[PDB]
Design a protein around this nucleic acid. Sequence first.
RNA 1: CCGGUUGGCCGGUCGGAUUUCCAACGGGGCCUUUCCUUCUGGCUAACCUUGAGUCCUUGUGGCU
RNA 2: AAUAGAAUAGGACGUUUGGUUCUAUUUUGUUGGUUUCUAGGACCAUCGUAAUGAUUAAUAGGGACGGUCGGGGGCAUCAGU
Lengths: 129, 81, 184, 150, 28, 87
Amino acid sequence: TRSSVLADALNAINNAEKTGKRQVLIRPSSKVIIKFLQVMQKHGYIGEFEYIDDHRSGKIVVQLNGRLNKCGVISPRFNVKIGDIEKWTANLLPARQFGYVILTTSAGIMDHEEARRKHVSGKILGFVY
Amino acid sequence: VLVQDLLHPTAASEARKHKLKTLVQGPRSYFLDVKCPGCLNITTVFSHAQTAVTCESCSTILCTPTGGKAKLSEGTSFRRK
Amino acid sequence: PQAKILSQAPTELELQVAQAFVELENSSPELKAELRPLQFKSIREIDVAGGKKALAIFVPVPSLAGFHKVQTKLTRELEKKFQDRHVIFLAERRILPKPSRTSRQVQKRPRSRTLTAVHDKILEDLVFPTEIVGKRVRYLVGGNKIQKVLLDSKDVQQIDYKLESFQAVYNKLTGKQIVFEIPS
Amino acid sequence: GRMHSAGKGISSSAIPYSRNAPAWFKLSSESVIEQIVKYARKGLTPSQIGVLLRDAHGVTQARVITGNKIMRILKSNGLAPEIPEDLYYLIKKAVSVRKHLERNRKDKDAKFRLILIESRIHRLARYYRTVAVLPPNWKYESATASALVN
Amino acid sequence: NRQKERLAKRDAAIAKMKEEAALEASKQ
Amino acid sequence: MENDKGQLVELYVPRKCSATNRIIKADDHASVQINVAKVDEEGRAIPGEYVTYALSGYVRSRGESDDSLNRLAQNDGLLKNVWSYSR
RNA sequence: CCGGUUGGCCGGUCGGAUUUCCAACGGGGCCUUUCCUUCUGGCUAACCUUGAGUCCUUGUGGCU
RNA sequence: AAUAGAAUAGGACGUUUGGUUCUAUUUUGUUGGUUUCUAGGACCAUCGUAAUGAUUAAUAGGGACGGUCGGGGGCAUCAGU
Ligand SMILES: [Mg+2]
Ligand SMILES: [Mg+2]
Ligand SMILES: [Mg+2]
Ligand SMILES: [Zn+2]
């Protein structure tokens, strides 16, 4: 069955960028997909995204510009320490200048830089660069 | 096909596709208000009525279930909704 | 009978609306026949950017089905006795708070009372008699949510002078900006 | 999907967007629930109340013009069956194919389909026992299934 | 359920008021 | 990039494709530089100044270089009713 | 609304010192329909009832 | 990310009202046996008001219904050189 919904969303985004289009049809929604795309939007990695209601569970349109070479999901949501942030920041990012790890923390969902300077941690979702 | 509106499709091509593959899922059915001339009364019948719906006074089969759409009786008028 | 139709909240604005009610049933025998058990809770005003104001009628919830056969004539008669105003009917529905980790003995909170459900109940009660055929949430690049709400083409003439009024009262009653659009 | 098979078909009811009652509908809620109860005294299962309600009376769905589903206003009158509809139909189908295979003892395909139907009865019995709209001491046996059908 | 009976009594009172004023509506 | 002192430490900042905003790198020999001269009011072209497009070889190997370039010309005010924003 | 801890624009000053000005960055407690609810006994502070004093503009001004 | 919380109401908050039960902190000069209030539990009714109280119906899945479809199966029968 459809196990994760964020995984199929981000896989659809990555496939539609690797074929070079400018728009997707993400289906279905969640809190997690909406807040994940808001985290991409606050860094300006995607443009407009748009949420369509249908009373079942909504389909999302994301108008992606060109700026995302790869986002992804880490599907076993591992528990990460404060000191374990450097390991995921070294393993999945390109280098130490850019590149983000997205966590669910009890203060909310935030990137790895915001989880460093929040001084909290949580469970890992994925990564946007 | 690098760019096209998935938010506002053209409505000629929008109801052209499948029932479940639209942007919001809509039925492609309707309701039929049928007038057999023998008793002159309004009966609201589904367009895909899958049973032998008779009239409430005369024993006239208004529609028979034939697969997709229910075929109406001959010499009998109908209206939308 | 302006001291009979209120619900224990005496102000000047509710008594002038109440006496306006009192002379509006008197010219009609059947609005007398329906209007007598029909009460309302309270009234407040809100201003719009169009230079005028809007009058919001709050409605106790089981009386809404009673209002839903009288609302058109009552709204048009109240607007042509009250100029420089906008008459909007909304239903006072109590929100229950989300229980926290330490929330004690509160019962299983009904989703008819929950926040997003009562917010879009205020949305479809805002724009009667037309009905909403699709919502669409516009996520701005700077992280701002704008709601786009669609309508039907059957009765556009009663609402088309009140769209900005509905946007103003909705952005004051839920804090969320909204835009309206008719389909082509 | 489509378990106990290999098909991948999608063929289902769509639902319209409108959560309110349709404009062309003119009948009241008390009238349609007394229509539901007079169809209920004829002993039909709730799918047929819904189908004959859709066809001859033009009611869109049960959930919109009254606030309830079909057995909410059927156990409000207390005419709900003691076992649910689909599980009862699976018992009826199982005893029909058991009648066929006691007629013919060389039909292997009917035997394997009996195994599939029995698996579906076990899974639905697990689910309906879990919610406890079925008593927890209920177990399937084929002779008691024939007793409950007959 | 005393509250359900109270709501039914309120609905019966509203219907009784409507049926009482229906004669005055049909008189005019 | 940039160092600390305030001086650019780069070889060249590469040409971005005008369709998909991707990098035209040095060995991308299928890349196209498109030159369009704008017009004078009496139907002449001033030969010095232009409007300008760049298409990567990724887009051109597909074949939507026409459709993306029609979009580029129509949103640059040069065209009307050729590329359609819906379909 | 509160005050934090960096960065500057000041240098007050015999290398650091703290307001004003600026972004920022988090933290907290309130108002928006809406957070921990109480019962009874002990302890401060505040609005009164009742008349008294110590200061200053003839004071239900401030302190008891 | 789970779990539970008002559906045969055997539901919730009351400074509503009936009884049934113990408790005894104190007093009646001190202690003991008493017995009558008063406070506090617990259990029955019956009396107030709460918008009385049930999440969408997944291009997840089961299950009816409809007209079909197939050298799918079993039993019987028939045909051909
Ligand atoms: Mg399987
Ligand atoms: Mg499928
Ligand atoms: Mg479904
Ligand atoms: Zn007839």
